[PDB]
Symmetry: C4
Subunit: 163 residues, 4 copies
């Protein structure tokens, strides 16, 4: 598995199943999966930062990012590739050393430029085929955790060590 | 695929899995799927208006339609066939030039009259046999996206063009 | 199918997948499936009343029974067999003309005494084996509708006649 | 195997790991009524049930109360420690505890109890620690599955309680 210095992740359709709950009062919900917090745990255990790119902008994601101690949160992003290219510049790494997981049209250009691209099994076929690794899980099922554990080559030895 | 000039759609059981969330206070929820927003994207990409016809009337659907910039919204509809005729009559459009997706008893008369009828895989057998194209997805799983993409013949080159 | 004069149904695990959403403030949610309203439609189309029996007692179910025009709503029920018995006395019918659907321990006694017992596929095996008809669907998937349509022999003819 | 105490994780056991956030700082969990049958059988056989969770919410406190769970420990940092405390207090060994958990912070405890349960949904390196097979995933009534297996609940038990 190639060398990774940064893990970037989309939210809707990755950390969730794409679900957007609306009530009558203008409030909104997302459903996260606690399993994906272990994706953060593994990244941080390995000294690798995690950044969230999303084109939505919600208090929902702000609070979830905070809860998970995510290193970067970029909301209302319209150009995901530009966002990553710039974060890479500030870190002095290149796209070949980023792992990005996304599921939709707005992710495609970034998925095509990164060192390892991941797309959940639930995503449209034309995005899915941009994946450079196989992911079994659908969004909301812990696919971000699956992506991280693959990208970082997390194995049983690592598991024994942390416990 | 025949020429389509208007895409119409039901909400519950199509944009959702039929889920209706009630609380203790009289509030109400629906769970939408961000994937279906690509249905609108593609429609608008090909210059095709989208309309929602629903028998329910909620602030939920009003706000959702607004967020997705849906072109026509009709709520509290008792006669979906009449509502589609009236909209179509305004636009100069024939029911044969309409693609409509619905999932239950109240959608049947319209489904039998449109140029392309779609029904999610989750729908009662009586309704699903009215579908004139095959849809794999269930309500809430992005079946509206699926419907639009097939109706408009969205292919890999369309995908390559928009990114 | 035998002659049925009353359809009775549990809520949790039948009309829902057994899910109970709790927030931080003491509020509560259930998720109903709009599909199950067709169960009430078909029952009423055949001149058969529907009654809810549940051990829970919530505003949630109160609203749902109202929205669906359910004929009878009994909540906080500690003994479902008795509750069904007095309602049967009150209506001048007996248990053999009742169709009941339930999914758990508190339903067991009533299920053994009704003319047609239904249990969702999702239920424990010891309850499931009391079903007197096969139900394919799980609670929350529209299994109440499946039950009513099977109990009343709803066929394509019936569908064609009501659209 | 002879059991004196059933302990259980929450998220990913009593739920599918789902955490709902709204825009206002509120939070939800989805429980399954099926799992209350877990408490029912436990109490029926005179076995107490305790909840160990690393989270801390009103959500769980209210669910535990509603289900009349015997023990509740939230914001737990070290689940092994929490369980030993309870075992010492009860005058029992971990060998007489059946525990079900689903993730890293359950591993230590899972490897020490007499019967360890892990939902089908759990990551594989946790799942392999299970000492009995559980078919069900978190949130599908897997706590009930566990109790029923651990206590050997059979049809005769069902006939008796009905
Ligand atoms: O389940 C509901 O809340 C209900 O209002 C009940 C009503 O009996 C039924 O006709 C409608 C219809 O299924 C929806 O309006 C379609 O959107 O649904
Ligand atoms: O999960 C619940 O909150 C609970 O109240 C717990 C209770 O111990 C159980 O017996 C009931 C019963 O399963 C429901 O009432 C079914 O409607 O459910
Ligand atoms: Mg996305
Ligand atoms: Mg519908
Ligand atoms: Mg029930
Ligand atoms: Mg857990």
């Amino acid at each position: 598995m190639k060398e990774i210095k940064l893990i970037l992740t989309d939210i809707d359709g990755v950390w969730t199943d794409g679900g957007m709950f609306y009530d009558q009062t203008g409030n909104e919900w997302k459903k996260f999966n606690t399993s994906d917090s272990a994706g953060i745990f593994w990244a941080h255990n390995k000294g690798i930062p995690v950044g969230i790119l999303t084109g939505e902008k919600t208090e929902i994601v702000r609070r979830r990012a905070e809860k998970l101690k995510v290193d970067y949160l970029f909301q209302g992003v319209v150009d995901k590739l530009s966002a990553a290219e710039e974060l890479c510049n500030e870190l002095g790494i290149n796209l070949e050393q980023v792992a990005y997981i996304g599921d939709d049209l707005n992710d495609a250009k970034l998925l095509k430029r990164v060192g390892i691209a991941g797309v959940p099994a639930s995503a449209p076929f034309y995005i899915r085929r941009l994946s450079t690794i196989f992911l079994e899980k659908r969004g909301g099922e812990g696919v971000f955790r699956e992506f991280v554990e693959k990208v970082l080559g997390i194995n049983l030895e690592d598991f024994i060590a942390v416990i």
